[PDB]
Structure formats: structure tokens, C-alpha cells
Design an enzyme around this catalytic site. Structure first.
Site, PDB file in Angstrom:
ATOM      1  N   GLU B  76       0.945  -1.391   0.291  1.00 43.08           N
ATOM      2  CA  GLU B  76      -0.203  -0.205  -0.080  1.00 43.08           C
ATOM      3  C   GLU B  76       0.668   1.865   0.479  1.00 43.08           C
ATOM      4  O   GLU B  76       2.268   1.516   0.556  1.00 43.08           O
ATOM      5  CB  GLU B  76      -0.899   0.276   1.054  1.00 43.08           C
ATOM      6  CG  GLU B  76      -1.944  -0.533   1.719  1.00 43.08           C
ATOM      7  CD  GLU B  76      -3.035  -1.649   0.744  1.00 43.08           C
ATOM      8  OE1 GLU B  76      -3.330  -2.265   0.167  1.00 43.08           O
ATOM      9  OE2 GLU B  76      -2.802  -0.003  -0.571  1.00 43.08           O
ATOM     10  N   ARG B  86     -17.982  -1.052   5.172  1.00 43.38           N
ATOM     11  CA  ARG B  86     -18.999  -1.278   4.461  1.00 43.38           C
ATOM     12  C   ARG B  86     -19.271  -2.966   4.870  1.00 43.38           C
ATOM     13  O   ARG B  86     -20.363  -3.221   4.620  1.00 43.38           O
ATOM     14  CB  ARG B  86     -17.742  -2.561   3.381  1.00 43.38           C
ATOM     15  CG  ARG B  86     -17.690  -1.341   1.669  1.00 43.38           C
ATOM     16  CD  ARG B  86     -16.907  -1.255   0.345  1.00 43.38           C
ATOM     17  NE  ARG B  86     -16.631   0.088  -0.338  1.00 43.38           N
ATOM     18  CZ  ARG B  86     -15.507   0.011  -1.080  1.00 43.38           C
ATOM     19  NH1 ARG B  86     -15.077  -1.189  -1.810  1.00 43.38           N
ATOM     20  NH2 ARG B  86     -15.461   1.160  -1.024  1.00 43.38           N
ATOM     21  N   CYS B 139      -8.127  -1.942   8.165  1.00 40.84           N
ATOM     22  CA  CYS B 139      -6.588  -2.060   7.389  1.00 40.84           C
ATOM     23  C   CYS B 139      -6.454  -0.710   7.726  1.00 40.84           C
ATOM     24  O   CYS B 139      -5.062  -0.100   7.701  1.00 40.84           O
ATOM     25  CB  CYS B 139      -6.494  -3.244   6.448  1.00 40.84           C
ATOM     26  SG  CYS B 139      -6.593  -4.971   7.081  1.00 40.84           S
ATOM     27  N   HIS B 163      -1.026  -6.311   2.457  1.00 45.67           N
ATOM     28  CA  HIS B 163      -1.882  -6.547   2.334  1.00 45.67           C
ATOM     29  C   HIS B 163      -1.576  -7.977   2.033  1.00 45.67           C
ATOM     30  O   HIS B 163      -0.989  -8.087   1.241  1.00 45.67           O
ATOM     31  CB  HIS B 163      -3.375  -6.063   1.421  1.00 45.67           C
ATOM     32  CG  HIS B 163      -4.360  -5.474   2.369  1.00 45.67           C
ATOM     33  ND1 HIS B 163      -4.221  -3.803   2.105  1.00 45.67           N
ATOM     34  CD2 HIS B 163      -5.148  -5.187   3.206  1.00 45.67           C
ATOM     35  CE1 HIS B 163      -5.159  -3.810   3.245  1.00 45.67           C
ATOM     36  NE2 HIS B 163      -5.972  -4.465   3.451  1.00 45.67           N
TER      37      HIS B 163
END
Lengths: 206, 206
Positions: B76, B86, B139, B163
Site C-alpha cells: 500500500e 462496508r 486495515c 495486504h
């Protein structure tokens, strides 16, 4: 109120970019809308976008882009200060790990009412979702420059970026590739314009 | 040299999170590595993460997370100041459109040598790619808080988020769901640690 709606020319092997059809359609039906199609060139797009913003001094700017492979209309929330071209632009340039604006913030959040816009699209039967990455190619490039100009010069007042899927005519020979009708895409962007317009108007009547 | 490696507990239906295996494996193999597993809870993860950062004062922090569905290890580059869950966390909390840090920058760029790490992973046969969205769940939350602590308190000196895909044992009943061997994931994270360590050391020379 003046509204700048930008699109992009064809790129990456595809002969068409539906944002051109959207911009043309909406500029013709909505008089307060000014349309401009940007070239898929970092150098030329930067010049063209900054020029139109300066000449028009729009109250609202909504940048449009084609997102090959996406299934829903994507309403972007984050523009990042990064150029990382995974493919060359139409001029053959492929810059990587270069800032869009030296010393500019790492990112800018879209200022149009993104969630409200997504929900309004869904209420009209249009598959739409919020997105947190507009990529690091020309689309993100235009999004960042627009939000940066707003933050530093005051125009536009609010702005955002909307990505649309391929239209059906663009995937006839593409296996397992999603598409969305042009009519729905035009309707979605129209809704985005109206919702942003209403939001800005009410904030000016207080 | 102190390196903090963080992971997460199981969440969203899966009874396992491979980052726990990765953290355990590398902390046992590399003395300078301190491991900490964070709960998948916005409230408790903030508390635990900030506490460990303060107690350890690591020079480097690499936050790990499971990215269900991704095919490659994702290094990332962008942490956004946004919580948009979500799905609820393990505590049943599902905050939306809330900043992680009031008044904090819209985003923080990862400061470990992300591209160098991705290329070294690939050189070693590990599918790896740069990513510009770490999501807006736990995260991204940990990534942002870690980089924010670095920027405001001085520790860690550099940081980032990685990730990893599901490991094979996690997708036995999941249709068309990609996975990557735990061994490769451990090797990839080890590479990230060593490359970050080398970059920090070289930046302190001369």
C-alpha cells in the site's frame, strides 16, 4: 451557476470513450453546462484543464472518465498527488513516481456530495458506488488538478470525479467484460450534476 | 533497530487471518522484530495500536492485513483519513464518513520503500503489486494511525501496510477465490522488512 463537465478522448486500444458522448449529450440539454474533452496526455491535459478552469471559472466541476472493467458508476472520493502510469499516454509518455503538484497535499477529498450522489443514482435504478482510488493515470490527474485549483484559487467551489463502465458497444469482442448502457450513464451524470448543484445552491441561500 | 510488525485477528466470517501466522513466524525468526495482533475493532484497535507504538518506539512499522480476494501481495502507498465500514467490525460497530484524526491530512503516503519492496518480491518469484487504496475498514485505519503517529511523534521513522491474499486453506469452499501459500507470504513480508531496514540504514549514512 456555471458547471464544467470534462471528459477524455479514446485511449488504451479502445476506439471510443463514452465520456465524450456523455459530455456532448448533457452540454446540449443543460445550458449551464460547459463541456470540454481532455486529451489522454499528462502534458497536454494539464495545460488544457488549467486553461478552461481559468477561462470559465466554473462554480462546479465534475470530471468524467472511463474505467474499463468496472461494473457500476464510480463516484470518486480521493484524488492522490501521484503519477504512476501503468501504460503510456497517447503521446507515448509513461511517468512514474512523480508528484502532480510539488509540495501539494498527498490527497484531496472530492467536495461534491459524493454519498448523496451515489444514493440518488441508486434510487433511480443506476448501479453506483463510492470509490477510494481513481487510479494514478490521467483520470486521477484531472481530479487532483481540479480539486487543487479549487483549494488554492477558489474555483471551482466544489468538484469531483465520476468513472463510468464501458458501454455495451465497446465490449462485443471482450470476454467477461462488464458494461452499462450509455443512457444510464448519461442519467447518472445528470443526477450527479443536479445533486451537486442543489447542494451548492442551498449552501448559498443560508 | 526495532521493527514492529502488526497483524489482525479473524473477521467477516473467516475463522483465520494468515497475518497472525506471518507475525508469529517472523518474530520468532528475526530478533529485532516485535509482533502485535490487533483486534478487528475500530475502538480497541486504536487503543492497542497507539499503546504498542508508544511502548515499543519502533524505528520501522509494517502493518499487515488480509485482503480477501486479492491475487497478489499488495504494498500500500496511500492511507486515507476516512472510516467507511462496508461491514461492521467484530464489535458490531459500522462507522461511516468519520475522520480517523480530526484535522489530520486527507492522506499519508507510505514511507517505507514501497516500489523497491514490490520489485524485490517479484525478483524472488512472489506476485506483488503497488496498491493505492487499502480500503476504508480496519486495515486502512491502522495504516493511517501508524503513519500519523510517525508524522506527529517521530516513531516509527518509516512505515507502511502490506495486504496478503487468503492462504489456500481458507478458500477450499470458496468459488473462484484466489489464494497464495503462507510460505510465499512470509517470504514476501520478510523481504519488505529487510528492504525497509536497508533503506533506513542507507539514508542515515554519510
Amino acid at each position: 451557476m456555471k458547471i464544467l463537465l470534462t471528459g477524455f478522448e479514446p485511449f488504451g486500444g479502445d476506439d471510443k470513450n463514452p465520456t465524450m458522448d456523455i459530455v456532448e449529450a448533457l452540454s446540449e440539454r443543460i445550458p449551464e453546462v460547459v463541456g470540454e474533452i481532455l486529451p489522454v496526455s499528462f502534458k497536454r491535459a494539464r495545460e488544457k484543464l488549467l486553461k478552461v478552469l481559468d477561462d470559465v471559472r466554473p462554480d462546479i466541476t465534475i470530471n468524467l472518465g472511463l474505467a474499463p472493467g468496472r461494473t457500476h458508476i464510480s463516484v470518486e472520493r480521493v484524488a492522490v498527488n501521484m503519477i504512476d502510469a501503468r501504460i503510456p499516454d497517447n503521446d507515448g509518455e509513461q511517468p512514474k513516481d512523480e508528484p502532480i503538484v510539488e509540495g501539494g497535499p498527498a490527497a484531496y477529498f472530492a467536495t461534491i456530495p459524493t454519498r448523496e450522489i451515489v444514493e440518488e443514482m441508486k434510487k433511480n435504478g443506476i448501479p453506483a458506488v463510492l470509490s477510494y482510488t481513481a487510479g494514478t493515470y490521467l483520470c486521477n490527474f484531472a481530479m487532483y488538478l481540479t480539486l487543487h485549483t479549487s483549494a488554492t484559487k477558489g474555483y471551482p467551489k466544489i468538484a469531483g470525479f465520476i468513472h463510468v463502465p464501458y458501454t455495451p458497444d465497446q465490449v462485443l469482442e471482450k470476454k467477461n467484460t462488464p458494461s452499462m448502457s450509455l443512457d444510464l450513464e448519461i442519467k447518472g451524470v445528470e443526477i450527479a450534476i443536479r445533486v451537486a448543484q442543489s447542494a451548492l445552491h442551498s449552501s448559498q441561500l443560508r
